[PDB]
Amino acid sequence: KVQIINKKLDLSNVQSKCGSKDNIKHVPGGGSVQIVYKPVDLSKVTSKCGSL
Amino acid sequence: KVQIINKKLDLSNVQSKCGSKDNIKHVPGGGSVQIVYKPVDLSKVTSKCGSL
Amino acid sequence: KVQIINKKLDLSNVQSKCGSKDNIKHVPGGGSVQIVYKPVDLSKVTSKCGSL
Amino acid sequence: KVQIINKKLDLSNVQSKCGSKDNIKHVPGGGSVQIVYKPVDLSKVTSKCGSL
Amino acid sequence: KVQIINKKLDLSNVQSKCGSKDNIKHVPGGGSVQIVYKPVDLSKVTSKCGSL
């Protein structure tokens, strides 16, 4: 049994990474194999700003 | 049994990554194989702003 | 049994990733195989803004 | 049994990704195979704005 | 049984890395194999700013 329950209060993009099981490489006579899976997050918050 | 329940209050794009099972590579005499799956998130929040 | 229930209050595009089962690669004498599935989210929020 | 029930209040495009079962690749003497399925979301919200 | 429950209050993009199981490399007569999965996070917070 797998469930994803996280209590987070953030003024940005939040992500919950839950895979449980992982991947495996076993390609007979394989030439090139690449597995890239990393959740990417990028944000910013602006509160009370007075340039002039 | 797999369920996705996360309590999050965010002024941005939130994502819940729940796969449970993972993928496997086993292509007989495979040449090139690539698996890329990473939830991408990008946002910004603007609250109370006074340039001039 | 698989269900998707997430309580989230966000002023942006929220996504619930629930696959449960994963994909597998096993193409006999396969040349090129590529699997890309990552929910992409991108938004912004504007509240109370005074340029001039 | 699979059901999709998510309680979300958002001023943007929200999507519930529920596949349960995944796809598999097994094309005899396959040349090129590509599977891309990632729900794409993109929006913005404007509340109380005073340029001048 | 694997679950992800973290109580964090942050004005930036927070991520919970929960894989449980890891990946393995075993490609018969494999040429080149690369696995890169590191959640990347990058943000900034602006509160009370007076340039002039």
Curated annotation (Swiss-Prot), chains A, B, C, D, E:
Interacts with MARK1, MARK2, MARK3 and MARK4. Interacts with PSMC2 through SQSTM1. Interacts with SQSTM1 when polyubiquitinated. Interacts with FKBP4. Binds to CSNK1D. Interacts with SGK1. Interacts with PIN1. Interacts with LRRK2. Interacts with LRP1, leading to endocytosis; this interaction is reduced in the presence of LRPAP1/RAP. Tau/MAP repeats lie at residues 2-32, 33-52. Glycans are attached at K7, K8. It is found in: Cytoplasm, Cytosol; Cell membrane; Cytoplasm, Cytoskeleton; Cell projection, Axon. There is a cross-link at K8, K25, K38, K44, K48 (Glycyl lysine isopeptide (Lys-Gly) (interchain with G-Cter in ubiquitin)). Expressed in neurons. Isoform PNS-tau is expressed in the peripheral nervous system while the others are expressed in the central nervous system. The record marks K1, K17, K21, K25, K38, K44, K48 as: Not glycated. The modification N6,N6-dimethyllysine is found at K38. This is Microtubule-associated protein tau. It is linked to In Alzheimer disease, the neuronal cytoskeleton in the brain is progressively disrupted and replaced by tangles of paired helical filaments (PHF) and straight filaments, mainly composed of hyperphosphorylated forms of TAU (PHF-TAU or AD P-TAU). O-GlcNAcylation is greatly reduced in Alzheimer disease brain cerebral cortex leading to an increase in TAU/MAPT phosphorylations. Frontotemporal dementia 1: A form of dementia characterized by pathologic finding of frontotemporal lobar degeneration, presenile dementia with behavioral changes, deterioration of cognitive capacities and loss of memory. In some cases, parkinsonian symptoms are prominent. Neuropathological changes include frontotemporal atrophy often associated with atrophy of the basal ganglia, substantia nigra, amygdala. In most cases, protein tau deposits are found in glial cells and/or neurons. The modification Phosphoserine is found at S12, S20, S32, S51. Disulfide bonds join C18-C49. Phosphorylation at serine and threonine residues in S-P or T-P motifs by proline-directed protein kinases (PDPK1, CDK1, CDK5, GSK3, MAPK) (only 2-3 sites per protein in interphase, seven-fold increase in mitosis, and in the form associated with paired helical filaments (PHF-tau)), and at serine residues in K-X-G-S motifs by MAP/microtubule affinity-regulating kinase (MARK1, MARK2, MARK3 or MARK4), causing detachment from microtubules, and their disassembly. Phosphorylation decreases with age. The modification N6-acetyllysine is found at K8, K17, K25, K38, K44, K48. Promotes microtubule assembly and stability, and might be involved in the establishment and maintenance of neuronal polarity. The C-terminus binds axonal microtubules while the N-terminus binds neural plasma membrane components, suggesting that tau functions as a linker protein between both. Axonal polarity is predetermined by TAU/MAPT localization (in the neuronal cell) in the domain of the cell body defined by the centrosome. The short isoforms allow plasticity of the cytoskeleton whereas the longer isoforms may preferentially play a role in its stabilization. The modification Deamidated asparagine is found at N6. The tau/MAP repeat binds to tubulin. Type I isoforms contain 3 repeats while type II isoforms contain 4 repeats. The chain holds residues 591 to 642 of 758 of the full protein.
